[PDB]
Amino acid sequence: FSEVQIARRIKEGRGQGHGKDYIPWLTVQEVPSSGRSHRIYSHKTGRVHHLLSDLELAVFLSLEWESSVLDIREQFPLLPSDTRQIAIDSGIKHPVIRGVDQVMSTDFLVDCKDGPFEQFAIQVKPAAALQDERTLEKLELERRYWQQKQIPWFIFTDKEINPVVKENIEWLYSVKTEEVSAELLAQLSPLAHILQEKGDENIINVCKQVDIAYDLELGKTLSEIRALTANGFIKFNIYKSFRANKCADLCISQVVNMEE
Ligand SMILES: [Cl-]
Ligand SMILES: [Mg+2]
Ligand SMILES: [Mg+2]
What we know:
The chain is of the alpha+beta class. 35% of the residues lie in helices and 17% in strands. It has two domains: 1-161, Trna Endonuclease, Chain: A, domain 1; 162-260, Arc Repressor Mutant, subunit A.
C-alpha cells in the first residue's frame, strides 16, 4: 500500500487532532477489493468520516447514535515503534510490504462522556476473516497494543449487527443519490422545522403531506430525506425501521457547504 514515503503522510497530520480536526490514517481512496467505502457526516465531530466497508459503516452508524460517544476517530494509526516491539516480543512478522514495515491502524478509537470507560478501541472484521492465520496474528499485534495502554479493545463482526440496523442500511445504501448539491442541503433547514412541529407523526405520512402541500411528485421528499440521511446530515433511530420512525426520531443539522 504505502512505501517509505509514509514519513510524509505522518507530516500531513494523519492520525492527529480530533473532532473536525482529526485526519484518518486511511481514507476512502485506500479502499480495497469490491469493498465499498463511505464518506458520512457526523453531528458529533462535525466532519465527514472515511469507512472502508459496509460493516465499518454499520459500526460507525451505531457509534454516531450513542449518546455517550463524544468523538470517533476512525482508521487510527498505531505507533510503529510500539508495534515493532510487540511483533518482536511475540514472534509475529510485523506487517511488511516490499520490505517496508507497514503502519497498522485500528478501525475506530472512540471517546465517551459517561460510559464504563472513557475511551475504547474497535476493530471491524467479517467473522470469516478470523479463520485465517495471518489475520489472527495481525489481530494479536493490535490486541496487545491496546492492552499495553489499558484501553479496552473489541472486535466487531457481521454477527454483531442488529437485523433492523442491517435492513435500514440496505434501504439507505442501494446508491440512490450522492449529489450533495447546495440545493439538497438547502432543504435541511425547511425540513427541520416541519419535522420539529409534526414531531409525533410518522415520518412517511409527513413525507406524503409535504409532497402534496408543495405539489411535488409522490415520493420526492422521502427521496430527499433518504439522501440526506444516507450522507449523515439527518440521524434517526437506526434500531427501528426508518419507516416506523416518528419525526421526533430524526435529528437534522446546520451543515453548510463549508465542508472542506
Ligand atoms: Cl470489515
Ligand atoms: Mg483497518
Ligand atoms: Mg478491519
